[PDB]
């Protein structure tokens, strides 16, 4: 069964976050771990996998630990040739090391043919009006929801100032995934109330390694603006 859509009090309010909105912005603004045809090299806890992945660009890490929801997932992927996509953090990361959640898909059989890319449609709703729509791309057949989530938020940060250093133009936001079997789920896009932001804790939602069919999945982003 589907996750029921948000109740009014399910959704975090950015007005109730008095920490730094930049710490959320940072997780999604041109920010991801990406690795291809890798195989885990080690483990810390029972539910995690460590990989030798170096960031090209700014050269900040060469090992990545991904935590999974349970031990069965770790065992399932441990010796598989995988591709990795996700949002990394350094604060309270403990095994040039960085930490993330989920992001795992088997490589073999998971790509479209002629170097093809699959376009996935994101409809954006602002105070319930579909104001803009845009496409994100993946070359994966079964893609993590996290990868599509990161791609969509990166675009909304840049095009819609979704997150800014001090705050956000939006009060609440969730990203909803609609699958072709009718299953739906959603992530809260705002930080928990209070004055600190816990990145390890926020990102932990991706631990389930949730995958969707890229060719068929529908995405909705539902935002509410501040005054009314
Ligand atoms: Zn691959």
């Amino acid at each position: 069964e589907s996750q029921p859509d948000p109740m009014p009090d399910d959704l975090h309010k950015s007005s109730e976050f008095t920490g730094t909105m930049g710490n959320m912005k940072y997780l999604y603004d041109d920010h991801y771990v990406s690795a291809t045809k890798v195989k885990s090299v080690d483990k810390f806890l029972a539910h995690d996998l460590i990989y030798n992945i170096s960031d090209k660009k700014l050269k900040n890490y060469d090992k990545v630990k991904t935590e999974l929801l349970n031990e069965d997932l770790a065992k399932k992927y441990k010796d598989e040739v995988v591709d990795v996509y996700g949002s990394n953090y350094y604060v309270n990361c403990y095994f040039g090391k960085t930490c993330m959640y989920g992001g795992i898909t088997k490589h073999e059989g998971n790509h479209f043919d002629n170097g093809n890319l699959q376009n996935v449609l994101v409809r954006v709703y602002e105070n319930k009006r579909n104001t803009i729509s845009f496409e994100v791309q993946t070359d994966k057949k079964s893609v993590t929801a996290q990868e599509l989530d990161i791609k969509a938020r990166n675009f909304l940060i840049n095009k819609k100032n979704l997150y800014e250093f001090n705050s956000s133009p939006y009060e609440t936001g969730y990203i909803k995934f609609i699958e072709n079997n009718g299953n739906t789920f959603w992530y809260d896009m705002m930080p928990a109330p209070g004055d600190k932001f816990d990145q390890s804790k926020y990102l932990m939602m991706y631990n389930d390694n949730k995958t969707v069919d890229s060719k068929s999945v529908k995405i909705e982003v539902h935002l509410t603006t501040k005054n009314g």
Side-chain angles (χ1 to χ4, degrees):
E1 53 146 88
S2 306
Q3 188 178 189
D5 280 3
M7 277 92 65
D9 61 351
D10 284 336
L11 293 182
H12 301 141
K13 303 160 164 68
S14 59
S15 60
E16 295 184 304
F17 175 70
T18 65
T20 284
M21 187 66 76
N23 314 276
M24 177 65 90
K25 178 170 175 210
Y26 168 83
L27 295 181
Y28 297 96
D29 183 0
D30 186 34
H31 185 88
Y32 54 95
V33 166
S34 198
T36 262
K37 309 163 63 173
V38 295
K39 185 192 268 206
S40 56
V41 278
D42 199 357
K43 306 193 79 184
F44 176 47
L45 311 178
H47 54 14
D48 71 48
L49 296 174
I50 300 156
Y51 289 93
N52 288 331
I53 303 180
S54 285
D55 79 319
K56 190 179 93 73
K57 302 109 74 129
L58 318 170
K59 206 62 64 179
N60 291 337
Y61 57 80
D62 52 318
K63 305 224 168 190
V64 171
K65 161 177 80 75
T66 187
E67 289 191 56
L68 287 160
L69 174 66
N70 48 66
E71 302 65 40
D72 294 321
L73 261 14
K75 273 191 182 220
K76 185 207 197 172
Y77 290 111
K78 180 188 193 303
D79 298 317
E80 284 286 322
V81 184
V82 299
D83 309 321
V84 180
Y85 198 106
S87 172
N88 65 116
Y89 68 99
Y90 297 88
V91 173
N92 306 139
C93 172
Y94 295 115
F95 317 9
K97 294 189 197 341
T98 204
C99 288
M100 54 176 278
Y101 292 95
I104 298 166
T105 47
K106 295 145 169 166
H107 164 67
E108 301 295 325
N110 204 36
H111 295 289
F112 303 105
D113 292 56
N114 298 47
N116 295 146
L117 289 195
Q118 177 67 228
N119 283 302
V120 179
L121 191 62
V122 193
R123 301 201 184 276
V124 184
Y125 290 89
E126 302 176 82
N127 307 324
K128 311 168 196 292
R129 269 289 304 144
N130 179 30
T131 57
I132 66 276
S133 298
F134 70 95
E135 297 187 309
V136 306
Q137 312 185 101
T138 174
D139 65 2
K140 289 164 180 97
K141 281 168 152 172
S142 184
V143 55
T144 71
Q146 177 176 13
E147 170 172 346
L148 307 172
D149 194 4
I150 293 160
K151 279 166 178 175
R153 303 203 206 178
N154 173 66
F155 173 99
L156 294 165
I157 293 167
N158 292 293
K159 199 301 168 216
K160 278 313 181 123
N161 302 160
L162 171 67
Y163 315 119
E164 301 176 293
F165 181 86
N166 294 97
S167 75
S168 174
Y170 309 102
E171 182 60 339
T172 73
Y174 63 99
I175 172 160
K176 182 187 177 180
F177 295 79
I178 300 106
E179 303 186 80
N180 81 324
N181 67 352
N183 187 54
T184 65
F185 60 100
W186 61 270
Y187 309 130
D188 201 326
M189 306 168 77
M190 299 284 170
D195 69 13
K196 49 61 217 71
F197 184 56
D198 193 335
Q199 294 168 342
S200 164
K201 199 185 183 152
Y202 182 75
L203 294 171
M204 170 174 293
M205 66 171 189
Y206 300 128
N207 67 181
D208 66 356
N209 211 51
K210 179 66 165 140
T211 56
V212 297
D213 188 70
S214 78
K215 185 179 268 303
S216 72
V217 62
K218 299 186 291 271
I219 303 168
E220 303 172 348
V221 169
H222 295 269
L223 299 163
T224 53
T225 63
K226 267 189 161 323
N227 350 110

